[model samples]
Target: TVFRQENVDDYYDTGEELGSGQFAVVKKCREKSTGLQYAAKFIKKRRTKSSRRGVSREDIEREVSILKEIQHPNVITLHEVYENKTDVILILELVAGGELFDFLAEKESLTEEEATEFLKQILNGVYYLHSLQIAHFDLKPENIMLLDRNVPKPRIKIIDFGLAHKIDFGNEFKNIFGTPEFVAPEIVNYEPLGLEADMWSIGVITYILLSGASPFLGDTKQETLANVSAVNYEFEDEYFSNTSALAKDFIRRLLVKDPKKRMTIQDSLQHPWIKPK
Candidate 1:
């Protein structure tokens, strides 16, 4: 398939490759029509003996369909999509804040103002998705893109809805998905989970946004998963220092292992850290 020269020019070049994934290479492209710039993730699927392990035809359609049904401010916008010859092209708005991981490491620690703004933005996006009943199974620092940090109000956009699923708020999804580091406790253990699983991942993300460390880890994948199933979270001076009491409290609601006892998104936002003052 030939690339559309006009569509490619929609975004002026930024620099080298912005990012890459298991299936695609992302290039910094500008939207010619709107003069807005974006990252274009170009994915080519090849059918082979290992296609089942990597990517499939319907799976591509699944992710594409999932993205089409969602629209939110905190989540990255999908500007355009093209499909040809076992390939799918996704045009996404370019967010300039760099990766959230870099932001955390730079400060050695984060301030309440920073965490509050980011969490609120995350929740604003979460609430919007929850309103539509979409759950982002993949929620982590690497997947989170930030805007230029010089401004007062920071914008955090959730990216990669490939693992995201639309679920019933009243029901539980039995499928276990997500990276080991950020997966919810109950989901990892094969216990029943609901939208709260998404919140649990948020808990891990909040911990990362401030502490710059993952709360759960082990020697092996199985060991790490077992640790996740135990629902252990750390809150010491090292982890909690410099951050406010409310911020620590904000994390407690999401760290719960049992999905049933987990805090609702509305209830969690009610915390002083994120509640509109």
Candidate 2:
């Protein structure tokens, strides 16, 4: 567990592992005090003289600091954090509703109303972050959490701000973060991307949630990157044939060539498709 603590047992008996990667392992844990459910992202830091990736204590500290600063309803709330000299514990908001990716995988997709309501919530959250000058680099369905079993229309919360930041919207952050499939074009090219980049990701998300197809996923990684750079996306007649003109307009404005040209959160929320209820 390069990023987990096993020996130090808490009241929480680790059940099935949620996920594990090079950096950390997430496990389902029940809080001893409240008896509530939660997912604890345990990160076991290696006490190495030096490592291949060159991750330092300072870097982890910075991550912790960034995690602490975020507190939006759309964003995942960091309930509590306990870190030792090496290991770090990030207790996150319990999203028992499961992953949006899982939701999409099971349903194949959602209806236009479902997509619109969900996208509206995401934009609302985005607007909140924008008010604070923060940007969520990742904005796919997977990061969007549903608070109800019914799905869509109400209670869609944005989570996972590991890549979120107070960035120069449209200027781009050099962190080179976020998942490639959902990453903005500038990031793939090692360039900075502003908050509008997040909108682009949302465009992709809206399209997939309704049509169940990625607009610009090419054959290979490079091809995909090229597609993003070239603004290579398509509005298949089959997909748009069913969606409203307003919905199409929303996507059209977001999936533009220049991130700077993308619509603002306010303008998007005001758009006929995503207009307030």
Candidate 3:
């Protein structure tokens, strides 16, 4: 978790901008010695003297800690870290493939089996995290990426650990954070949250991937939150006409109002839709 006190440019040559966020920018870079490709994530350090706008040091450290601990094929790999006066540079594994939904959208056709493959990869990654008592609070399509879409079945990689937290025993964690549409009822109700919240998001993701429609989405954020809290959603014929009964059942089990009743990652991995054995 140490941040090297040296220039990022000293070892790697940065290239085109890959993407950016509120206080972070990711760019393609090549290692000086090995000529290896990587993504350099430059995160802005909060200005302690004047403004409270940029990312906090605590937040950056938390993300780095989580990234350092995990080493799964489906999870993004952290190569190294560097710190300057204004920013922290994280050298991460370069995932060239785009977002999950974006890759699916580019396809001319999609099948339940194909969708199941993708979902299985996601579940596997979540299972690994849950085994370690960690919960990725923010699980959405945006955080899911394909390694290379050009392959027959591109490998999925779970990215963005900014909101990820390890759930320690006897330490009850409760917070109202995550995307409105994918958040579980417990989140909207402000109840004690856990790994179950991620399962709920997986349910929403599964629903959208198979049906091409959000289960609890609404016109406004309030409406969406209300819909999620109320568990107000249905499988319309327009979207589910071609979907399988097992697929619908899979989503049904995961999107329960009670987190206790919601499907566990193990349950999901063994579901007929995912395993089929």
- Best candidate, TM-score: 3
Q: Sum up the clashes in candidate 3.
A: 0
Cα lDDT tens digits for candidate 2, 1-277: 1333443346465566777767777788887767877777777766685655323565566556666776766666777666666667777776666766566567644677766766666787888888777777778877887665474343767876656666654553575466666777777776666777788888888878777788888888778888887888888987667877777788889887677788888778788777645
Per-structure clash totals for the candidates: 8, 7, 0
Q: Name the lDDT value of residue 155 in candidate 3.
A: 98
Better of 2 and 3 by lDDT: 3
Give Cα-based local distance difference scores for all models.
0.74, 0.72, 0.91
RMSD of every prediction: 3.6, 3.9, 1.3
Q: State model 2's lDDT.
A: 0.72
Ranking by TM-score: 3, 1, 2
- Model 3 scores what on Cα lDDT? 0.91
Between prediction 2 and prediction 3, the one with superior TM-score is 3
Write down the TM-score of every candidate: 0.85, 0.84, 0.97
Off by over 4 Å in 2: 1-13, 53-55, 104-109, 148-154, 168-172
